[PDB]
Design a protein around this ligand. Sequence first.
Ligand SMILES: *[C@H]1[C@@H](O)[C@@H](O)[C@H](O)[C@@H](CO[C@H]2C[C@H](CO[C@H]3O[C@H](CO)[C@@H](O)[C@H](O)[C@@H]3O)[C@@H](O)[C@H](O)[C@@H]2O)[C@@H]1O
Length: 330
Amino acid sequence: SDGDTAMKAFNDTFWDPNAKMFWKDSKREKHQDFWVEAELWELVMDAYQHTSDPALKAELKTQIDDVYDGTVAKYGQDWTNNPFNDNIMWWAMGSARAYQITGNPRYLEAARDHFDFVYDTQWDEEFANGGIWWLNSDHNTKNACINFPAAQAALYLYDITKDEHYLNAATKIFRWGKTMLTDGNGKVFDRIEIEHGAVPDATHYNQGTYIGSAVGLYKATGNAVYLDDAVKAAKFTKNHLVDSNGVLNYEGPNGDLKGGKTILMRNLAHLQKTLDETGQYPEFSAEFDEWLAFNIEMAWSHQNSDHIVDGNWATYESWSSAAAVQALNG
Ligand SMILES: *[C@H]1[C@@H](O)[C@@H](O)[C@H](O)[C@@H](CO[C@H]2C[C@H](CO[C@H]3O[C@H](CO)[C@@H](O)[C@H](O)[C@@H]3O)[C@@H](O)[C@H](O)[C@@H]2O)[C@@H]1O
């Protein structure tokens, strides 16, 4: 399977079985940044779910536990001292996913405790009638990269616990974010700052977590408006965050944005599966599938002799390189 070759290659190149972390790059000098490591954790979980190679599956399943243990060995179990609410929420979401796959109670405790800290203490209605602050150290801006991943984490917690509190939280966060952090037509704004107001800079990862939270709200509530919201955001992405040949942008040099295609592809796959299951937006579904297959082909054609694909699809770094592996594990 294409997703097999890609994930095995990625592990061969970047996985450090000693530290139980990914290397940040092929110089193997530094391990990956904390939040990105949650995104590679999710990549291992997607490859686990995608593969039908029984041997590779059982190995990726041990690696789910290892990625957690390697990060907890370095940083500890309690991430609530991290000043970036997004750092905390990426790991809360990953932990919720690890609970769904493994049923290990440690992952539910990590997901729930870290989600509850952020939502309970960092949701605010004094500025802009709602939304979660970017930081817990300073309160100046409310950002797409915390609010939509928080809605996603709440949806996973809802699916796990069936505690309606988490569906209420997902709904409250998503509705606020669609109002204050999008143009209402599927373009997701980076953030809203107290002084300057909205910053209407769109990126792959914020498109992605808005699409994912919208699809998850559709799945939890059956309300087709949420699927309309996801489709609008996928249409924005495919017509704007692409080059003139329709290949998804390379978002360097910012290190956080370089691998954002990973988070976008993961969430576009959720949308593709939901359209395929529901028969919603059939015209768009056919166009969307053609455009995704084109992007995946383009990434595949960009692999080196070790079957690694740098993020510039049209020294290798694990975040930039992850996007092709995620694309083949949809
Ligand atoms: C939370 C956590 O993962 C931190 O480790 C990480 O440093 C934070 C980075 O987030 C900030 C930067 C993100 C990228 O910003 C750049 O691109 C934006 C979109 O084009 C521009 O608006 C911005 O000026 C800059 O060029 C940004 O997406 C995020 O909202 C933060 O501002 C992380 O949040």
